[PDB]
C-alpha cells in the first residue's frame, strides 16, 4: 500500500507518533517518504546480510528477525514479515522501541540526512488531523 502523506500522517498520529519523544509528526512522515516513499511493502537489501522492511524500513540485523540475517538481534521482538502490512501498527510499535530518547530518529539515515534541518511540518500542513 502506497499512502498519501495526509493519510499516513493521520495514521501515525492516531498511533501516538505526534510529538513522540518530542519529535513533531512531520519528522515521521518525512522519514517514511525518504525511507519507503510511503510504500508499506518497501524492502531493501544492504551490502551486509541486512534487509530493511516496511513503511519505516526496519533493519533485520538489529530490530526484526527475518531469518536470513547473520547476527540478528531482533530488538523489537517481531518477525520482519509482520512489518509489511497496510496496517502500520507493528512498524510504529517497533519504531517507538527504536526511538527511546530525543535523538532516536537518527536511527533512520534518510531522516538525519534528508529530513532534519528541513521543514518537516510541510509534509503535514493542510492534512485534516
Amino acid at each position, epitope marked *: 500500500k502506497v499512502f498519501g502523506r495526509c493519510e499516513l500522517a493521520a495514521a501515525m498520529k492516531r498511533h501516538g507518533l505526534d*510529538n513522540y519523544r518530542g519529535y513533531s509528526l512531520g519528522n515521521w512522515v518525512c522519514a517514511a517518504k525518504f525511507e519507503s516513499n510511503f510504500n508499506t511493502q518497501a524492502t531493501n537489501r544492504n551490502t551486509d546480510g541486512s534487509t530493511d522492511y516496511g513503511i519505516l524500513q526496519i533493519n533485520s540485523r538489529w530490530w526484526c528477525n527475518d531469518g536470513r540475517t547473520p547476527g540478528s538481534r531482533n530488538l523489537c521482538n517481531i518477525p520482519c514479515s509482520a512489518l509489511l502490512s497496510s496496517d502500520i501498527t507493528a512498524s510504529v510499535n517497533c519504531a517507538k522501541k527504536i526511538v527511546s530518547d530525543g535523538n532516536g530518529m537518527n536511527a533512520w539515515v534518510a531522516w538525519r540526512n534528508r529530513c*532534519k534541518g*528541513t*521543514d518537516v*511540518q510541510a509534509w503535514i*500542513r493542510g492534512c485534516r488531523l
Partner: antibody
Amino acid sequence: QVQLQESGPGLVSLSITCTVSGFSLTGYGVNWVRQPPGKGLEWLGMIWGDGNTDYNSALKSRLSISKDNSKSQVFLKMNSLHTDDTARYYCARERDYRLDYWGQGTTLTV
Amino acid sequence: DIVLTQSPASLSASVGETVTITCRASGNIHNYLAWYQQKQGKSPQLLVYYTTTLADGVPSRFSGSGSGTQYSLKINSLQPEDFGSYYCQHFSSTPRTFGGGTKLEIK
C-alpha cells in the same frame, strides 16, 4: 554546549553575525528575533538547516538572511534602517519548532 | 498572516498563587505554540513547546494547554523565580509571530 553569540555594528545597510557552536547549522534552523527597548519580541526571519529562508512579511523587502555552514555563522542584513529598528537583536536555534537556545543578543541603535 | 493576541498585559500576584496567561491565534496553529519566559536583562528561555510539553528543567507547576486557535499557560503556586515576562510564539508555517507579552509581577 550549544551556544550562539550575536556580533553587530552597534550603531548605523545593517549587518549582524550569529556565531554558533555545539551543533551543525545543517541540522537546525536559526531564527532572528528583535526586541525594542522595554518592548516585546518581534520575529524577523529564519534560515532552515537546508538553507531555505523565510521572513517577517512586513520587513521582508529589507531583510536578507544567509549563512556559512563551514564557519558556523549566520548573518542578518537589514537595509533602510530607521529609528524603529533600534532594539536588541537575537539569533536563536530552532529545534523542531521551538527556539531552544538563544544568544545573549546585541543592542543596535539606528 | 497569523496574529497572536496574548492577555493580560500584566499580572500582579503573590508566591503560592495560581495564574493563567492566554494566547489566541487569528488562525488555527495546530498545537504549534511555544511559551518563553524572560527575566529582566536576560534572553528569553524556552518553557513549553508544542502546546503542552515542558522544556528540560522546567518545573511541573508550569502547564500548557490548548488546541486550534486558543491556548494558555498556567503556573500553579508560582514561585519567586517565576516573576518576569512571558511570550507565546506560533510555528504554524513560516511567518512566525509572538504574542504581545505578559509581565508577571509581585503583588
